[PDB]
Amino acid sequence: TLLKNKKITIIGAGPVGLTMARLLQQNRVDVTVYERDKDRDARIFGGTLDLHRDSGQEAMKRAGLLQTYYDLALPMGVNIADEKGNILTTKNVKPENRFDNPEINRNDLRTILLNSLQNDTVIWDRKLVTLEPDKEKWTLTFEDKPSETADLVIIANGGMSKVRKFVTDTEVEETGTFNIQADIHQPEVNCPGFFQLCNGNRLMAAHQGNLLFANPNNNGALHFGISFKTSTLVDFQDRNSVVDFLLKKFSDWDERYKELIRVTSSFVGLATRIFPLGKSWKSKRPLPITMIGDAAHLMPPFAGQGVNSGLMDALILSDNLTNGKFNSIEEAIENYEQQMFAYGREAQAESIINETEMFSSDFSF
Ligand SMILES: Cc1cc2nc3c(=O)[nH]c(=O)nc-3n(C[C@H](O)[C@H](O)[C@H](O)COP(=O)(O)OP(=O)(O)OC[C@H]3O[C@@H](n4cnc5c(N)ncnc54)[C@H](O)[C@@H]3O)c2cc1C
Ligand SMILES: Cc1c2c(c(O)c3c(OC(=O)c4ncccn4)cccc13)C(=O)[C@]1(O)C(=O)C(C(N)=O)=C(O)[C@@H](N(C)C)[C@@H]1C2
């Protein structure tokens, strides 16, 4: 009722935006998703994503996808190693905790979410450039593509979104650490020494403020990442400059780690950043609009709370908009933002605290 004959547009077909789209569409809501990726076959780079039971899994449950998540996700243990290649601890998943926090490849999650939507709910190859209000509808401008309108816009285009001004003037800021990620295909062949060291579990190692993390089985490929405090001699279009840089930092590390670096094809550098939730968001806005996911609360990932929190937003907002407990769309948005600020600020605190704690000189897991 609240959203009757209201054309809702979600900006961004990431895991958060898609989940939002499903929760709305399964409630008989007219919802459109705009995604800049040219087609659905576009591969999503990055590691695996873990769904927390009180948040991520609850969102999939309400979307009717919980069993699909378990069907596709893979439970994984964790090994803590040192720079010399020794396994300090073995956290081999207990059978009884096997279905607590399994790991679903990012593309798999995109696929199940898309499959839960009606055909053509997502419009590919649509990069939103500007968002300008009218007396009654939004005007959405896409780069070299026809513009569109909407009554309510939900921003979900990531932590580096540039279309936030109408909601908040808050700016993204760097937290002081840097992450270098990569994928190795057929790791058993290219990096056998380090592959066997993982031995099915995910290796986390820290020495001299340089932390290493690895998932040996991300849909057949090994995804790993290296992080450290930041501050540039490195060009990421030049894997040679990256290797020289990493081998100097990892000179103290065992050759099996050096083998991992030497075989990596493409390096991806990213500074750790946060979209702080300190100051409240704009009070009066021209038309109904809000934000969800990383666009709302980017935070360091060292606490594994990013996607889990973003899904909480999609769950709360969609619930508020369809449970008939709010007199207006604006009030329903306000309530969501009130709730989101509370637990979202907490999540940021944990991720930053864990960040500072992990890259401290005394850290030892
Ligand atoms: C290195 C790293 C590791 C992480 N590890 C974990 C982990 O182990 N566990 C965990 O639970 N979480 C983890 N996270 C958090 C997780 O990645 C995010 O919280 C989650 O992906 C946010 O989803 P989202 O859709 O809100 O944003 P994103 O995932 O950034 O997706 C945004 C979407 O918007 C689209 N888009 C971009 N530009 C535009 C545009 N102009 N117009 C329209 N659409 C656009 C993008 O293509 C994409 O579809 C990690 C994050 C990082 C960076
Ligand atoms: C430190 C940390 C990492 C990861 C986590 O998932 C963590 C986590 O997640 C959960 O399991 C969980 N969440 C909520 C509820 C229950 N359980 C919880 C706590 C800490 C985690 C990664 O997966 C990681 O992405 C990873 O492996 C790689 C890589 N191999 O490339 C990265 O380099 C790292 N960073 C810096 C890019 C990441 C490290």
Determined by which method? Answer: X-ray
Per-residue CA distances from 233 to 204, 242, 244, 338, 343 (Å): 26, 9, 10, 44, 39
**In this structure, are residues 344 and 309 in contact, taking their beta carbons and an 8 Å threshold?**
yes
Largest CA distance in the chain: 65
Task: Tell me how far apart the alpha carbons of residues 78 and 89 are, in angstroms, rounded to a whole number.
Answer: 8
Give, using CA atoms, the residue closest to atom 52 of ligand 1. 301
DSSP H helical ranges for the chain: 15-25, 56-62, 66-72, 106-116, 187-190, 192-198, 239-249, 255-263, 294-297, 306-322, 329-358
Q: Is 310 in the pocket of ligand 1 (CB under 6 A)?
A: yes
Q: Is 293 in the pocket of ligand 1 (CB under 6 A)?
A: yes
**In this structure, are residues 275 and 294 in contact, taking their beta carbons and an 8 Å threshold?**
yes
DSSP 8-class letter at 345: H
Between the CA of 286 and the centroid of ligand 1 the distance, in Å, is 27
Between the CA of 15 and the centroid of ligand 1 the distance, in Å, is 7
In 3D space, the residue among 287, 285, 297, 311 whose CA is nearest the CA of residue 58 turns out to be 311
Phi, psi (deg, nearest 5) at residue 102: -70, 170
- The H helix count followed by the E strand count for the chain is 11, 17
Question: What amino acid occupies position 80?
Answer: I
Resolution of the experimentally solved model in angstroms: 3.3
Q: Is 49 in the pocket of ligand 1 (CB under 6 A)?
A: yes
- If DSSP codes are grouped into helix, strand and coil, which group holds residue 351? helix
Which ligand ends up closest to the CA of 273? 1
- If DSSP codes are grouped into helix, strand and coil, which group holds residue 243? helix
Question: What amino acid occupies position 337?
Answer: E
Residue extent(s) of CATH 3.30.9.30 domains in the chain: 174-273
Q: Which two tokens stand for residue 286?
A: 């021209």
Residue extent(s) of CATH 3.50.50.60 domains in the chain: 8-75+104-172+275-358
What class is the 174-273 domain? alpha beta
In 3D space, the residue among 299, 314, 215, 268 whose CA is nearest the CA of residue 14 turns out to be 314
**In this structure, are residues 200 and 216 in contact, taking their beta carbons and an 8 Å threshold?**
yes
Beta bridge partners of 265: none
Q: Which residue has tokens 């279905």?
A: 99
Task: Tell me how far apart the alpha carbons of residues 37 and 125 are, in angstroms, rounded to a whole number.
Answer: 5
Q: Is 318 in the pocket of ligand 2 (CB under 6 A)?
A: no
Q: Is 16 in the pocket of ligand 1 (CB under 6 A)?
A: yes
DSSP codes joined into one string, 145-160 = EEEEEESEEEE-S-TT
- If DSSP codes are grouped into helix, strand and coil, which group holds residue 80? strand
Task: Tell me how far apart the alpha carbons of residues 25 and 222 are, in angstroms, rounded to a whole number.
Answer: 35
Task: Tell me how far apart the alpha carbons of residues 302 and 308 are, in angstroms, rounded to a whole number.
Answer: 13
Q: Are strands 103-104 and 49-50 parallel, antiparallel or unpaired?
A: antiparallel
Q: Is 267 in the pocket of ligand 1 (CB under 6 A)?
A: no
Which ligand ends up closest to the CA of 161? 1
Phi, psi (deg, nearest 5) at residue 222: -95, 120
Q: Is 202 in the pocket of ligand 2 (CB under 6 A)?
A: yes
Which ligand ends up closest to the CA of 143? 1
CATH architecture of 8-75+104-172+275-358: 3-Layer(bba) Sandwich (3.50)
CA angle 53, 46, 106 (to 5 degrees): 50
Q: Is 308 in the pocket of ligand 2 (CB under 6 A)?
A: yes
Between the CA of 322 and the centroid of ligand 2 the distance, in Å, is 33
Q: Which two tokens stand for residue 199?
A: 């031995």
Q: Which residue has tokens 């077909």?
A: 13
Instruction: Report the run of H or E that residue 178 belongs to, with start and end.
Output: strand 173-185
DSSP H helical ranges for 15-148: 15-25, 56-62, 66-72, 106-116
